[PDB]
Write a protein that holds these residues in place. Structure first.
Motif, short mmCIF file in Angstrom:
data_model
loop_
_atom_site.label_atom_id
_atom_site.label_comp_id
_atom_site.label_asym_id
_atom_site.label_seq_id
_atom_site.Cartn_x
_atom_site.Cartn_y
_atom_site.Cartn_z
N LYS A 36 0.82 -1.22 0.00
CA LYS A 36 0.00 0.00 0.00
C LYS A 36 0.85 1.26 0.00
O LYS A 36 0.58 2.23 -0.75
N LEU A 37 1.90 1.28 0.82
CA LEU A 37 2.77 2.47 0.87
C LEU A 37 3.37 2.78 -0.49
O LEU A 37 3.39 3.91 -0.94
N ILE A 38 3.86 1.76 -1.18
CA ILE A 38 4.43 1.98 -2.51
C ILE A 38 3.37 2.44 -3.49
O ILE A 38 3.63 3.36 -4.26
N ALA A 39 2.18 1.85 -3.48
CA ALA A 39 1.08 2.27 -4.34
C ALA A 39 0.71 3.74 -4.14
O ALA A 39 0.34 4.44 -5.08
N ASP A 40 0.77 4.23 -2.90
CA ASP A 40 0.46 5.62 -2.61
C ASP A 40 1.45 6.61 -3.17
O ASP A 40 1.15 7.80 -3.27
N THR A 41 2.68 6.18 -3.52
CA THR A 41 3.69 7.07 -4.01
C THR A 41 3.33 7.68 -5.35
O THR A 41 3.83 8.77 -5.64
N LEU A 42 2.51 7.02 -6.15
CA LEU A 42 2.10 7.57 -7.43
C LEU A 42 0.75 8.27 -7.37
O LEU A 42 0.34 8.84 -8.38
N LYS A 43 0.07 8.24 -6.22
CA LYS A 43 -1.19 8.97 -6.09
C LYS A 43 -0.93 10.40 -5.62
O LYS A 43 -1.83 11.24 -5.67
N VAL A 44 0.27 10.69 -5.13
CA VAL A 44 0.60 12.04 -4.69
C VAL A 44 1.33 12.71 -5.84
O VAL A 44 1.91 11.99 -6.66
N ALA A 45 1.38 14.03 -5.92
CA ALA A 45 2.09 14.63 -7.04
C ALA A 45 3.20 15.58 -6.64
O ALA A 45 3.43 16.61 -7.30
N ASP A 46 3.93 15.23 -5.58
CA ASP A 46 5.09 16.02 -5.18
C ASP A 46 6.14 15.10 -4.56
O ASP A 46 5.84 14.16 -3.81
N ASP A 47 7.40 15.45 -4.81
CA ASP A 47 8.54 14.74 -4.33
C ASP A 47 8.69 14.60 -2.83
O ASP A 47 9.33 13.60 -2.47
N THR A 48 8.28 15.58 -2.04
CA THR A 48 8.46 15.44 -0.60
C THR A 48 7.56 14.36 -0.03
O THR A 48 7.97 13.57 0.83
N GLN A 49 6.30 14.35 -0.49
CA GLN A 49 5.42 13.30 0.05
C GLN A 49 5.91 11.94 -0.42
O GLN A 49 5.78 10.93 0.28
N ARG A 50 6.41 11.89 -1.65
CA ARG A 50 6.91 10.62 -2.20
C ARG A 50 8.06 10.08 -1.36
O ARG A 50 8.11 8.92 -0.97
N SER A 51 9.05 10.92 -1.10
CA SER A 51 10.22 10.62 -0.32
C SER A 51 9.86 10.20 1.09
O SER A 51 10.43 9.27 1.66
N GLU A 52 8.86 10.86 1.68
CA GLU A 52 8.39 10.50 3.03
C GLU A 52 7.81 9.10 3.03
O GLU A 52 7.97 8.37 4.03
N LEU A 53 7.06 8.76 1.97
CA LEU A 53 6.48 7.43 1.83
C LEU A 53 7.55 6.37 1.60
O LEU A 53 7.51 5.29 2.18
N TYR A 54 8.58 6.71 0.79
CA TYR A 54 9.67 5.77 0.59
C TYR A 54 10.32 5.50 1.95
O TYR A 54 10.68 4.36 2.26
N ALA A 55 10.50 6.57 2.76
CA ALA A 55 11.09 6.36 4.08
C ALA A 55 10.22 5.50 4.98
O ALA A 55 10.73 4.64 5.72
N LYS A 56 8.89 5.65 4.90
CA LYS A 56 8.02 4.80 5.74
C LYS A 56 8.05 3.36 5.25
O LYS A 56 7.96 2.40 6.01
N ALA A 57 8.14 3.13 3.95
CA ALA A 57 8.26 1.76 3.41
C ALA A 57 9.55 1.12 3.87
O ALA A 57 9.57 -0.07 4.26
N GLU A 58 10.66 1.89 3.93
CA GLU A 58 11.90 1.29 4.48
C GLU A 58 11.71 0.91 5.93
O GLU A 58 12.12 -0.16 6.39
N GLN A 59 11.06 1.76 6.71
CA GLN A 59 10.74 1.50 8.11
C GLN A 59 9.87 0.26 8.26
O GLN A 59 10.10 -0.49 9.19
N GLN A 60 8.87 0.05 7.42
CA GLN A 60 8.06 -1.16 7.46
C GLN A 60 8.87 -2.43 7.26
O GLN A 60 8.75 -3.46 7.94
N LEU A 61 9.74 -2.39 6.24
CA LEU A 61 10.69 -3.47 5.96
C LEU A 61 11.55 -3.74 7.17
O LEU A 61 11.77 -4.87 7.63
N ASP A 62 12.11 -2.67 7.77
CA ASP A 62 12.95 -2.83 8.93
C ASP A 62 12.18 -3.37 10.14
O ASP A 62 12.64 -4.24 10.90
N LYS A 63 10.94 -2.93 10.33
CA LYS A 63 10.13 -3.42 11.44
C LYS A 63 9.85 -4.90 11.25
O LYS A 63 9.87 -5.68 12.20
N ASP A 64 9.64 -5.32 9.99
CA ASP A 64 9.40 -6.75 9.75
C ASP A 64 10.67 -7.57 9.71
O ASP A 64 10.63 -8.81 9.65
N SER A 65 11.82 -6.90 9.63
CA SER A 65 13.10 -7.57 9.52
C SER A 65 13.09 -8.53 8.36
O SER A 65 13.51 -9.69 8.45
#
Length: 517
Positions: A448-477
């Motif tokens: 879902k986080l990755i899918a949301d990256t193309l529904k927004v139309a600015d780089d800052t929100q995109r980058s914030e979502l990429y950072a949350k997706a990395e955090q999800q990966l890290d939380k799941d190890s």
């Protein structure tokens, strides 16, 4: 190549490059690794190629435009030809991208068309619609139009990758799986195949039909399959190899910076070294077990003590220097190793792993001095910090990749290099349905986080979502990050044209030249 004024060129323009292993294949729709891409870029050219600094630049397409980032139109140069003299047309690209998308091809890179979001790809991959529904069309022989289901501003960046290169339909249909043999193959890059002896060498010769042939300098290039980094260095130093592969031996490296400094090239590289965990195989389907392995690995010892080749300890999957990455450093990375070790021992104990019942599992790696020395160091570290028993197993490259897709492993040595410089080049591989998901990781929150990256139309929100997706990966190890690579290789002083400035290392032998020596 662009030879500088004043340079004297050798009379013989031949090159020998080590390529790390035997390629899985020469068919652009069947390959997924760096060794395979190295040869592919010399034989098959797509819409865009990289220039000597890594920027996406005209390949078969001389110019392109987009409308709202959803409809992209490529104007193909009229003198692009295949090595049999026939024209490269927009129809070749239509056929080729439909073949990539088609389930009957079973391309390991089928999901690359989902990453670009070409219209209808999901249904095509699922068998619901035929490959002829793909959203690409030839408007005429020189005009290729692609329709996406969403606006993708970095779409053109994807196009330098081998899986979106053209394949010649007439050879594919006539010879099937043998179309890549030297007598049958047809190519559109600066070289063509002269010889292929499995586990010995691949020899390419200049392709006179290539549209930019007047600028190609090297007439023949040989790719070798040596997977021993120590052997690659020895044959380099004996004079047989002009450019080593870019995996360096622990045994000799530090010695080489001292002995031959002007030949050692060390540049930024967008790749991450990690231990891939099979997330659907028990007991690795338990997060506590994955987290314990992640925490008990001591990166300072591995990176700075054992390898010590310039790599950076990693705490994420996407490299923090990828264009668009603004990652949050997880708190466990700042802890001391003693706290990481105690927390890991606690977690394993909660998982049911005692001292009478220690966790035992295999560590699979592809044949290599570097990966073997590292797997031995990592098994010791884990044994000593967690009391875990690890059985090492080596496989040849093509078999190793296969085993990972099949899921018949526990933990494996891994490494991913970007295909384009944008965080989704890494993050798209952990999508639940990705054909590149060898960790077998499945998370609806991540997807879902990755899918949301193309529904927004600015780089800052995109980058914030990429950072949350990395955090999800890290939380799941999902994985065990080890280090961010550096691109280190030896290159003879008479090899001109290699800048080291492209962080994707998309080298083309058509750009190199041999200085008289």
């Amino acid at each position: 190549a662009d030879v500088p004024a004043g340079v004297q060129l050798a009379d013989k323009q031949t090159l020998v490059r080590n390529n790390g292993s035997e390629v899985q294949s020469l068919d652009p729709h069947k390959i997924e690794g760096v060794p395979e891409s190295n040869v592919s870029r010399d034989l098959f050219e797509g819409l865009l190629i990289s220039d000597v600094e890594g920027h996406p630049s005209p390949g078969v397409a001389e110019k392109w435009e987009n409308k709202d980032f959803k409809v992209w139109t490529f104007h193909l140069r009229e003198n692009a030809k295949w090595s049999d003299g026939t024209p490269v047309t927009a129809h070749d690209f239509v056929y080729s991208w439909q073949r990539l998308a088609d389930p009957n091809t079973a391309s390991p890179y089928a999901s690359y068309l989902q990453y670009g979001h070409i219209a209808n790809i999901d249904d095509i991959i699922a068998g619901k619609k035929p490959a002829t529904d793909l959203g690409v069309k030839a408007l005429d022989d020189h005009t290729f139009e692609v329709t996406l289901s969403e606006p993708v501003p970095y779409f053109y960046k994807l196009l330098v990758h081998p899986s979106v290169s053209p394949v010649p339909k007439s050879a594919v249909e006539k010879f099937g799986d043998k179309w890549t043999q030297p007598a049958n193959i047809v190519t559109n890059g600066a070289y063509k195949l002269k010889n292929w002896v499995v586990n010995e060498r691949i020899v390419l010769e200049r392709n006179p039909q290539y549209w930019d042939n007047a600028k190609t300098v090297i007439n023949q290039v040989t790719y070798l399959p040596i997977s021993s980094e120590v052997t690659d260095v020895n044959r380099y130093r004996s004079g047989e190899i002009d450019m080593t592969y870019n995996n360096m031996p622990i045994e000799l490296f530090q010695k080489l910076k001292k002995e031959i400094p002007n030949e050692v090239r060390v540049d930024p590289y967008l790749c991450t070294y990690y231990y891939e965990i099979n997330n659907q195989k028990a007991p690795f389907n338990d997060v506590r077990v994955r987290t314990a392995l992640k925490l008990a690995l001591d990166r300072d010892i591995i990176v700075n003590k054992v390898k010590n080749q310039g790599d950076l300890p990693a705490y994420s999957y996407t490299p923090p220097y990828t264009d668009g990455a603004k990652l949050v450093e997880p708190e466990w990375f700042k802890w001391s190793q003693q706290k990481r070790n105690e927390e890991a021992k606690k977690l394993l104990a909660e998982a049911g792993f005692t001292a009478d019942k220690p966790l035992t599992f295999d560590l699979l790696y592809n044949t290599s001095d570097l990966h073997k020395k590292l797997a031995i160091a990592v098994a010791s570290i884990w044994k000593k910090n967690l009391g875990v028993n690890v059985n090492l197993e080596n496989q040849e490259w093509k078999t190793f990749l296969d085993t990972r897709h099949q899921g018949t492993f526990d933990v494996a040595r891994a490494g991913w290099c970007a295909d384009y410089n944008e965080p989704t080049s890494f993050l798209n591989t952990m999508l639940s349905d990705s054909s590149n998901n060898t960790a077998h990781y499945k998370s609806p929150a991540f997807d879902k986080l990755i899918a949301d990256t193309l529904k927004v139309a600015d780089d800052t929100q995109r980058s914030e979502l990429y950072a949350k997706a990395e955090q999800q990966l890290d939380k799941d190890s999902a994985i065990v990050p080890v280090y961010y690579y550096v691109n280190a290789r030896l290159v003879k002083p008479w090899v001109g044209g290699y800048t080291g400035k492209d962080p994707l290392d998309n080298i083309y032998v058509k750009n190199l030249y041999i200085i008289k020596h």
